[PDB]
Amino acid sequence: SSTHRKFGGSGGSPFSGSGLSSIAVRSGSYLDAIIIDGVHHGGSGGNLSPTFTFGSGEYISNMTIRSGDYIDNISFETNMGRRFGPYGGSGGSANTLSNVKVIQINGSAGDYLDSLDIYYDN
Numbered sequence: 590s591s592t593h594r595k596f597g598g599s600g601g602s603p604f605s606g607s608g609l610s611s612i613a614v615r616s617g618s619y620l621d622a623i624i625i626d627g628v629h630h631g632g633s634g635g636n637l638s639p640t641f642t643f644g645s646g647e648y649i650s651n652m653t654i655r656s657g658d659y660i661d662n663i664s665f666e667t668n669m670g671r672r673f674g675p676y677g678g679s680g681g682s683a684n685t686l687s688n689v690k691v692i693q694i695n696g697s698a699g700d701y702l703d704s705l706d707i708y709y710d711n
């Protein structure tokens with residue numbers, strides 16, 4: 590296999606997302622945490638989003654991340670046309686993974702979400 594792309598900065602401690610079955614975030618001006626399959630990655634600040642639960646073979650087909658030294662914003666669309674976000678702030682540069690299949694979301698987090706490493710098929 591896959592392509593991957595890293596977003597964000599160097600802080601935090603690494604994590605792996607595991608199978609992409611459900612996602613929620615905590616955000617304010619930037620990302621406090623991402624919660625993947627009920628597992629928390631990041632801090633306790635900001636506001637907690639609703640949980641997006643993927644339906645049977647649903648996957649992320651478009652994803653937009655705004656980031657700088659931290660992850661500032663996340664949004665995505667799925668192959669079924671469902672949407673998540675945006676959650677976070679303006680700030681950072683924006684980048685979109687367009688018409689892909691996201692297979693893993695790994696990253697690094699502490700009290701905030703420092704970085705994401707997105708693995709995807711083009």
Ligand SMILES: [Cl-]
Nearest residue numbers: 657658659661
């Ligand atoms: Cl930042």
